Design a protein around this ligand. Structure first.
Ligand SMILES: Nc1nc2c(ncn2[C@H]2C[C@H](O)[C@@H](COP(=O)(O)NP(=O)(O)OP(=O)(O)O)O2)c(=O)[nH]1
Ligand SMILES: [Mn+2]
Ligand SMILES: [Mn+2]
Ligand code: NA
Ligand code: NA
Length: 327
DNA sequence: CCGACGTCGCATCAGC
DNA sequence: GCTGATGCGA
DNA sequence: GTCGG
């Protein structure tokens, strides 16, 4: 519905979620809060009491309490106090740097490193990923208009075909779902000489080429099948530089192409829903295969997949275009 | 009461 | 030197 | 923190 129906409640739960993940390092409380925030966000009525909220799956006793305090006072004592806490709030903030998780963040704050300015003063203490996360902190939190996404796609598809015309490159993620803007670019890569059964540097060659034409600018991580890095559109004339963008490139077995594209097209919430209904119907799905579950619930051999629809067919669900996979 | 809470690739750390 | 464990992001 | 064995 509309995000101001219970926006105060869901903002509260989301904030609680972050402090559980980043500060308390309690990942399951983090997910519990977000699960509750999500079900309340869909609730098409303005919540009048914690008890009313408790009817929803994922909303229990403790969250019911907190909603009652929020409704009555417009705030949470615990949340106000945690905000005022220098240590906790510093740890929470530092995890916004890509590469800095709850563990590294706590470690930094322990030795007095609390801000971005503290981080820049201490490059020695940052690993490769974290330095780049720091370097492009502002850029990485910017969103990408679809127009720039299309220019980025133009370059990717072009340079990929130049290396080898038998490559297949597919931009997935929110882009494939037709989103008007994206958080990054996700690229799936496929080549005839790489299948599940069976050239040594297939992913490397593409990365190398995208670097040569100055599209890819930084490397966060790179292995045989997964590239995580930074890219940037070229500027014209003197007209000022574009923001640096996050880009992932994945090389998948050609015979497992459709499971891969389904998986990395998402959305995340769509995938977990599809996986739940897959278990409901006695199947299991990952980024590679769909496999039947025997009577005792053990996965069998990968099924033949020749399209995305085939995966939908197996679990008795009406085919849905990428644009309808919001959830 | 108390165990489950997706899974995966890469970077880095712990320890032989 | 290596294997196994853990952090991290998606 | 929530759910359910
Ligand atoms: N295994 C796994 N896959 C995920 C997860 N989250 C997302 N994905 C799988 C499915 C995600 O949809 C997807 C591609 O990753 P993104 O770029 O991170 N997400 P998207 O492109 O939809 O949003 P954005 O516009 O902000 O970039 O990969 C996750 O938590 N776990
Ligand atoms: Mn994406
Ligand atoms: Mn991504
Ligand atoms: Na409930
Ligand atoms: Na981070």
């Amino acid at each position: 519905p509309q995000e101001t129906l219970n926006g105060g409640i869901t903002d509260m739960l989301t904030e609680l979620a972050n402090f559980e993940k980043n500060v308390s390092q309690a990942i399951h409380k983090y997910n519990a809060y977000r699960k509750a925030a999500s079900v309340i966000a869909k609730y098409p009525h303005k919540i009048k009491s914690g008890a009313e909220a408790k009817k929803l799956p994922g909303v229990g006793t403790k969250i019911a309490e907190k909603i009652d305090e929020f409704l009555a006072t417009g705030k949470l004592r615990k949340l106000e106090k945690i905000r005022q806490d220098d240590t906790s709030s510093s740890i929470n903030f530092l995890t916004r740097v890509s590469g800095i998780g709850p563990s590294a963040a706590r470690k930094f704050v322990d030795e007095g490193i609390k801000t971005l300015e503290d981080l820049r003063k201490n490059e020695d203490k940052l690993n490769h990923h974290q330095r780049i996360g720091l370097k492009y902190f502002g850029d990485f939190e910017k969103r990408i208009p679809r127009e720039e996404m299309l220019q980025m796609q133009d370059i990717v598809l072009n340079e990929v075909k130049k290396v080898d015309s038998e490559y297949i490159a597919t931009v997935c993620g929110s882009f494939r779902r037709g989103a008007e803007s994206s958080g990054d670019m996700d690229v799936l890569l496929t080549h005839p000489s790489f299948t599940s059964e069976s050239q040594p540097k297939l992913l490397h060659q593409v990365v190398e080429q995208l670097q040569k034409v100055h599209f890819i600018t930084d490397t966060l991580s790179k292995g045989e099948t997964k590239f995580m890095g930074v890219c940037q559109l070229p500027s014209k004339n003197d007209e000022k530089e574009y923001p640096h963008r996050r880009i992932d490139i994945r090389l998948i077995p050609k015979d497992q192409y459709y499971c891969g594209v389904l998986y990395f097209t998402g959305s995340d919430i769509f995938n977990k829903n599809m996986r739940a209904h897959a278990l409901e119907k006695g199947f299991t799905i990952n980024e590679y295969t769909i496999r039947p579950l025997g009577v005792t619930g053990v996965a069998g051999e990968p099924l033949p997949v020749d399209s995305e629809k085939d995966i939908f067919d197996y679990i008795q669900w009406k085919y849905r275009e990428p644009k309808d996979r919001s959830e």
